[PDB]
A = this chain, B = another copy of it.
Amino acid sequence: GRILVIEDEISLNKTIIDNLNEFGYQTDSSENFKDGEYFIGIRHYDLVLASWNPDGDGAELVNTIKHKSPRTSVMIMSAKADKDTEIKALKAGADDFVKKPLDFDILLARIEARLRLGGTNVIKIEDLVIDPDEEKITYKGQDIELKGKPFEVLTHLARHSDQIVSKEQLLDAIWEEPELVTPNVIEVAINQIRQKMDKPLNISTIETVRRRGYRFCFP
């Protein structure tokens, strides 16, 4: 929710900030690029709203923002609304081009859409993240080499944490033709998980409950 605005009109700059704050956005402000590039250096801003028109290096501005702070969105506001200025701003890297006099109902809607994030299937528990989409596990910032069916078994359990899952359940949930395989696979997979993480990373992620099943228990 961090947006910084680079506008040399004080009125507009004042205006723009008050609108963003009203919406809910943490915001910073600059009247020149010099100061602006400074802020992006200190902390990340989800989006940057800057004027195309003092130094007149907007095309370069977009580039420098994308370089210094690659994850940020650049929105360019310009009173010259001709196709040439629109096309040239987008072609320079701008993620969106808005037109001033500013419609703040439309602007807020575009910023929103520009910072809309898709729902994820990612699981973050304490210093551990488990990303099914990328088949990735990291604890304490280090990747864990766990994949395949052991990966699915761990993720399944994580999704049903504090709940006891049974071999049959895991098999049906993760194994096609579950009635054509050796249940030993579950035990082997659990060992793999303990081996890859529990053991080397000194944690207790999976717990076995006699005659009932396993349960993710990483507090």
Among A97-117, those with CB < 8 Å from B are 103, 105-106, 109-110, 112-114, 116
Residue of B nearest to A88 (CB): B109
Nearest CB on B from A150, distance (A): 13
- In the complex formed, the residue of B with least CB distance to A94 is B113
Is the pair A93, B66 in contact by a Cβ cutoff of 8 Å? no
Expressed in whole angstroms, the Cα–Cα distance for A113 and B70 within the complex equals 13
**Which residues on the B side are within 8 Å of A114 (C-beta)?**
95
- Among B66, B163, B215, point to the contact of A120 (Cβ < 8 A): B66
Closest B residue, CB atoms, query A71: B118
- State how many angstroms separate the Cβ of A126 from the closest Cβ of chain B: 12
Name A201-219 residues within 8 Å CB distance of B.
Answer: 209-212, 215
**Which of chain B's residues have a CB closer than 8 A to the CB of A112?**
90-91
- Does A133 contact B73, Cβ atoms closer than 8 Å? no
Residues of B within 8 A of A135 (CB): 164, 209, 212
**Contact A134/B73 with A66-B119, A109-B87, A112-B90 known, Cβ cut-off 8 Å:** no
Q: Which residue of B lies closest to A209 (CB)?
A: B135
Decide if A27 is an interface residue (CB 8 Å cutoff): no
Assess whether A86 is interfacial by the CB under 8 Å rule. Answer: yes
Instruction: Check if A70 sits within 8 Å of B106, measured CB to CB.
Output: no
B73 touches A93 (CB 8 A): no
Alpha-carbon distance A16/B110, docked complex (angstroms): 24
A71-B118, A210-B147 given as contacts; is B90 within 8 A of A113 (CB)? yes
Mask of A73-96 contacts with B, CB within 8 angstroms, 1/0:
100000000010011001101111
User: Is A106 a contact of B121 with CB atoms below 8 Å?
Assistant: no
A105 and B118 in contact, given A134-B164, A135-B212 (Cβ under 8 angstroms):
no
Determine if B93 and A120 form an interchain contact, defined as CB atoms under 8 angstroms apart: yes
CA gap between A67 and B133 in the complex, in Å: 15
Shortest distance between the CB of A87 and any CB in chain B (Å):
4
CB nearest neighbor in B for A211: B148
